[PDB]
Structure 1
Amino acid sequence: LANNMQEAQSIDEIYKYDKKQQQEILAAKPWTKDHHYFKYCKISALALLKMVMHARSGGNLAVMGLMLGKVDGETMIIMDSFALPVEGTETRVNAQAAAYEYMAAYIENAKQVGRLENAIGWYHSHPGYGCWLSGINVSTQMLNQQFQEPFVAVVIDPTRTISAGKVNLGAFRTYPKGYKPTIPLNKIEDFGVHCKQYYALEVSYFKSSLDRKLLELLWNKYWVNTLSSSSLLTNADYTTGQVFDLSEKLEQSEAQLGDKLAKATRDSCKTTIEAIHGLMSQVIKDKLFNQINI
């Protein structure tokens, strides 16, 4: 924990809110020009944890809520998530009367304490029903996007997440009216009949310096799973798939050349860095264990 910096780190400016910049970016409205504008959604660790806990706590029923944050450039930042007092069946949720009063009161109370962020989106949980936009979510997301432009639909699946051990969070945004534009068919199948109406987004997560510092001492028995990590063995299929997509991207960039090369180089660097990190861990293990009593 020493021989480094302990003050405001380079992962804390993401948590800083600038009112003037947000006002300028809201007045600019760069989203209306290119409709494929937003492509990245950065969610805080706290927001994701709260969303997953609330979705799982609902049991087999469906739950819904809001999420705060802001928007910068080509990315949407989602910082906090607060639930709603909704009473939904196994398929549909309504949020009839007490949900909106809760929204207004909670936003006002949060602004009282110091929460300077505004509402940035809504989320609703599919209890084992995959991760896609239904014919009602599409309509309500279009309704929200028509007037409150900075918005995003987050879909979470609690049952599948708890059964498979991996979170299933999907960020989506709807195209406006009249916007038309051995390989698996899941690309069309896993979406509803409105597959051409909405498009997904790249979901990433971030955490603060204090978040990582406190989570470093979260538990002191994963060291065994790190020493006997067995890297380059549990994700070989991942690396082969990455190599295949990298070859496809290289072919596309070569066709274009005859700026697309930048993302291909980035993907290649990422895959190679992962492989080199795995080899480094294996070399460290070999030096630690097998180089003793020779």
Structure 2
Amino acid sequence: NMQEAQSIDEIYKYDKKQQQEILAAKPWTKDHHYFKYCKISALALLKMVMHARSGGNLAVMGLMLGKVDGETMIIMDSFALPVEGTETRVNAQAAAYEYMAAYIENAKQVGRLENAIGWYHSHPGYGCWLSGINVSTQMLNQQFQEPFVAVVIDPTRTISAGKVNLGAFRTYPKGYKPTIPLNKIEDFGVHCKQYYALEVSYFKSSLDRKLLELLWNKYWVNTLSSSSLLTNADYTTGQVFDLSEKLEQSEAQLGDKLAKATRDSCKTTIEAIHGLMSQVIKDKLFNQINI
């Protein structure tokens, strides 16, 4: 069951005509919040993470390759740049651009049919947000290269907490505003009203899943007995709290959001039913032997 292109690998197709039609029509010119979804390949995340950690506490960055399907940015590769940078400020003077177009020209022959879809930057341990000059960077990147998104990575937070600190951001055009609050400015920038985040999800290939499932498990009291359904109790409480506001906004709209709210609630209920199933299978495995 590998020769056929399943629903998992169907995203690995680069249709030149469809992308050309999308880039010619330009539906994003009218709707400012046109893009919402950001799908990212696994290996891009891997290369990004290893490049961020290889530089240590020095900021590193690169250009990513991908396409756009409707309102979803599908990124299929990451790439490193030969730049010199400090903890907070970088230049990318000439070496990056001497290894940017040359890399594209080289990749045109190996089989890489993708083009520039955005850039990722590593912020070492000071949040996932668009800086005061990075917002202008995405300003002039989007003003002429409309299919585009800025990716921000925190290496220190990911390496310490254990969760991927990834953020996909796009900015509003100058003039589109819709005194600063004290809760949306610490997790964002001082120009938080000038940019918004996009939902981020990842995809992989069928052979990737097959290799992962046979790589190494052990994980008997590491996964099969790990206080499941309980470790993310704070996550579930936060989710069940914000579904209240989601449903109340949906009801106000009724007096569409409701499908999104139902999907959001279904995700949590399915996750915790999976936790219950794991607990039940553990009970049937260990407790009920040798009565």
TM-score (norm 2): 0.95
Cα root mean square deviation, aligned: 2.1
Residue 161 (structure 1) shift: 1.6
More off after superposition, 275-284 vs 177-186? 177-186
C-alpha separation in 2, matches of 1:142 and 1:278 = 44
More off after superposition, 271-280 vs 4-13? 4-13
Per-residue CA shift, 1:1-47, capped at 9, x if unaligned? xxx77743220001111111111111110111110011111110000
Residue 184 (structure 1) shift: 9.8
Per-residue CA shift, 1:120-169, capped at 9, x if unaligned? 00111111121111111111111110001111111111122212222211
Per-residue CA shift, 1:36-91, capped at 9, x if unaligned? 01111111000011111101111121112100000001110111011010001221
Identity of aligned residues (%): 100
Verify: 1:101 aligned to 2:98, yes or no.
yes
Aligned residue for 2:28, secondary structure, equals coil
Verify: 1:206 aligned to 2:206, yes or no.
no
Residue 223 (structure 1) shift: 3.8
Aligned residue for 2:181, secondary structure, equals coil
C-alpha separation in 2, matches of 1:232 and 1:183 = 38
More off after superposition, 132-141 vs 221-230? 221-230
Aligned residue for 1:227, secondary structure, equals coil
Residue 185 (structure 1) shift: 4.3
Aligned to 1:120: 117
C-alpha separation in 1, matches of 2:179 and 2:121 = 34
C-alpha separation in 1, matches of 2:180 and 2:200 = 24
Aligned residue for 1:68, secondary structure, equals strand
Task: Within 5 Å, give how 1:79-94 maps onto structure 2.
Answer: 79-94=76-91
C-alpha separation in 1, matches of 2:181 and 2:25 = 41
More off after superposition, 152-161 vs 176-185? 176-185
More off after superposition, 184-193 vs 102-111? 184-193
User: Unpaired segments of 5 or more residues in structure 2?
Assistant: none
Per-residue CA shift, 1:168-194, capped at 9, x if unaligned? 111111111111019994422222211
In structure 2, the CA distance between the partners of 1:289 and 1:19, relative to structure 1 (3 Å rule), is: same
C-alpha separation in 2, matches of 1:281 and 1:105 = 51
Contact 1:173 1:201 in 2 (8 A): yes
In structure 2, the CA distance between the partners of 1:276 and 1:137, relative to structure 1 (3 Å rule), is: same
Contact 1:64 1:93 in 2 (8 A): no
C-alpha separation in 2, matches of 1:125 and 1:248 = 33
In structure 2, the CA distance between the partners of 1:182 and 1:97, relative to structure 1 (3 Å rule), is: closer
C-alpha separation in 1, matches of 2:284 and 2:179 = 44
In structure 2, the CA distance between the partners of 1:184 and 1:241, relative to structure 1 (3 Å rule), is: farther
Residue 244 (structure 1) shift: 1.1
C-alpha separation in 2, matches of 1:143 and 1:102 = 21
Contact 1:43 1:206 in 2 (8 A): yes
C-alpha separation in 1, matches of 2:272 and 2:253 = 28
C-alpha separation in 2, matches of 1:59 and 1:139 = 26
Contact 1:40 1:74 in 2 (8 A): yes
Per-residue CA shift, 1:268-294, capped at 9, x if unaligned? 211111121111111111111111111
C-alpha separation in 2, matches of 1:56 and 1:177 = 35
C-alpha separation in 2, matches of 1:6 and 1:243 = 42
Aligned residue for 1:221, secondary structure, equals coil
Per-residue CA shift, 1:182-228, capped at 9, x if unaligned? 99944222222111111111111111101111111121322442321
C-alpha separation in 2, matches of 1:121 and 1:188 = 25
C-alpha separation in 2, matches of 1:17 and 1:191 = 35
C-alpha separation in 1, matches of 2:130 and 2:257 = 30
More off after superposition, 155-164 vs 105-114? 155-164
